[PDB]
Amino acid sequence: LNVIKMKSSDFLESAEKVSLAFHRTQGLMIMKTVYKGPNCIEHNEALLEEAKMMNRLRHSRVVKLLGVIIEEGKYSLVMEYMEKGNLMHVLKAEMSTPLSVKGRIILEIIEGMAYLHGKGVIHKDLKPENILVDNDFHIKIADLGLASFKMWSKLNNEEHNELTLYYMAPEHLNDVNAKPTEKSDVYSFAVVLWAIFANKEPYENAIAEQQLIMAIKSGNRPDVDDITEYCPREIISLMKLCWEANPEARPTFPGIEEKFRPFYLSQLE
Ligand SMILES: O=C(c1nc2n(n1)[C@H](c1ccccc1)C[C@@H]2F)C1CC1
Ligand SMILES: [Br-]
Ligand SMILES: [Br-]
Ligand SMILES: [Cl-]
Ligand code: NA
Ligand code: NA
Ligand code: NA
Ligand code: NA
Ligand code: NA
Ligand code: NA
């Protein structure tokens, strides 16, 4: 389905920024309020078309943009509701996630990124907080930071509006000139891989941001010995392949899928 021009009145009053919302006739949804301030109707057509463009990225592992709210002095994006929150919340839950499910999660992240890259989309902000999980532990990739919503991100920072580095490729640390590439996303995926088996964030011993940044650029990586549960040797090799310093030596997501899928099916599923 295409993007719906929804209205603020469509949602139940819950006055008392991604939050849960209840559409009067459609049910639970996620709302990201982006702008609240003076009237800026000059940008409406530009904001709507960008939402239409983003809404065209349709894939089983990509979150759906259900609608937009474009009113006088109020602009919001309305997104599919993923009941279980983000991947890091799932990994830290009291109930353990079995290896078969972790393998499926990895495969689905690969499928989603292969789709996005095939559409010429570079995510640039891939991390557990942008990987959302539904009731059945299937995942969908999101862009909650608006890294790909150029127009909406600019709106979010217009001053008249009232309203992590662990997964960033080293070529981007301490460097604003560096333009992210598909290979930047592959590096982020490598660290997500580590997090999936560590059940936590990397670099817990880092003491200072400058220490952490200079260390990673010098070759430091998440502590593979820190994984406490069983992590298949193939997956350790995979993450090492994906966080290699030379970006052009990192594989593609289709290349990752070609070797991970048959391994998932014979060992993990
Ligand atoms: O997080 C959001 C969101 N909305 C959409 N996605 N994420 C998908 C997507 C994923 C990765 C890269 C680009 C788009 C396509 C869809 F339009 C909304 C709340 C801001
Ligand atoms: Br090299
Ligand atoms: Br593999
Ligand atoms: Cl394949
Ligand atoms: Na599915
Ligand atoms: Na990061
Ligand atoms: Na730090
Ligand atoms: Na390296
Ligand atoms: Na295959
Ligand atoms: Na398969």
UniProtKB/Swiss-Prot annotation:
Subunit structure: Homodimer. Interacts (via RIP homotypic interaction motif) with RIPK3 (via RIP homotypic interaction motif); this interaction induces RIPK1 phosphorylation and formation of a RIPK1-RIPK3 necroptosis-inducing complex. Upon TNF-induced necrosis, the RIPK1-RIPK3 dimer further interacts with PGAM5 and MLKL; the formation of this complex leads to PGAM5 phosphorylation and increase in PGAM5 phosphatase activity. Interacts (via the death domain) with TNFRSF6 (via the death domain) and TRADD (via the death domain). Is recruited by TRADD to TNFRSF1A in a TNF-dependent process. (Microbial infection) Interacts with mumps virus protein SH; this interaction inhibits downstream NF-kappa-B pathway activation.
Residue ranges of domain Protein kinase in the record: 11-264
Lineage of origin: Eukaryota, Metazoa, Chordata, Craniata, Vertebrata
Signal peptide: none
Associated clinical condition: Immunodeficiency 57 with autoinflammation: An autosomal recessive primary immunodeficiency characterized by lymphopenia and recurrent viral, bacterial, and fungal infections. Patients exhibit early-onset inflammatory bowel disease involving the upper and lower gastrointestinal tract, and develop progressive polyarthritis.
Function: Serine-threonine kinase which is a key regulator of TNF-mediated apoptosis, necroptosis and inflammatory pathways. Exhibits kinase activity-dependent functions that regulate cell death and kinase-independent scaffold functions regulating inflammatory signaling and cell survival. Has kinase-independent scaffold functions: upon binding of TNF to TNFR1, RIPK1 is recruited to the TNF-R1 signaling complex (TNF-RSC also known as complex I) where it acts as a scaffold protein promoting cell survival, in part, by activating the canonical NF-kappa-B pathway.
Organism: Homo sapiens
Post-translational modification: (Microbial infection) Proteolytically cleaved by S.flexneri OspD3 within the RIP homotypic interaction motif (RHIM), leading to its degradation and inhibition of necroptosis. Cleavage is crucial for limiting TNF-induced apoptosis, necroptosis and inflammatory response. Cleavage abolishes NF-kappa-B activation and enhances the interaction of TRADD with FADD. Proteolytically cleaved by CASP6 during intrinsic apoptosis.
Name of the protein in its database record: Receptor-interacting serine/threonine-protein kinase 1
